[PDB]
Amino acid sequence: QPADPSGQQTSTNTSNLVTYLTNLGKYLGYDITQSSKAPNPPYSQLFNSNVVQLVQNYAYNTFLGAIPVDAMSQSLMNFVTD
């Protein structure tokens, strides 16, 4: 059959595409050829939100409560009025 040059052109283009996406994935520092070396399952969130949130609210509370303050009546140790 008379082969259409468009098909060969697209085949060469797609081989160029796979080559160049391999090159760019290489440049980003990853090996894209094999899926096994890729992580499984993926992770985009942080390691553990719970431990860090606990630490941060605890630090906030400890800083608020730690500093000495005039303590003779409730309205007089006040940090913020209203």
Binding site: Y43, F47, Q56, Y58, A66
Partner: protein
């Protein structure tokens, strides 16, 4: 029931000193909650940016 205790110096300590070494962290590979640098060692770029 969940009464837990910290001071402000010790809490600011373990807020500073939680990523570089960690006593609670597992020091043997293959276990969860490993050292933060080892967790980073397998972290995703989006993950590390969120850490930033």
């Amino acid at each position: 029931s969940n009464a837990n205790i910290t001071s402000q110096a010790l809490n600011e300590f373990n807020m500073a000193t939680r990523r570089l070494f960690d006593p609670t962290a597992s020091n043997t590979p293959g276990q969860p909650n490993q050292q933060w640098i080892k967790q980073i060692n397998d972290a995703s770029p989006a993950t590390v940016q969120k850490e930033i």
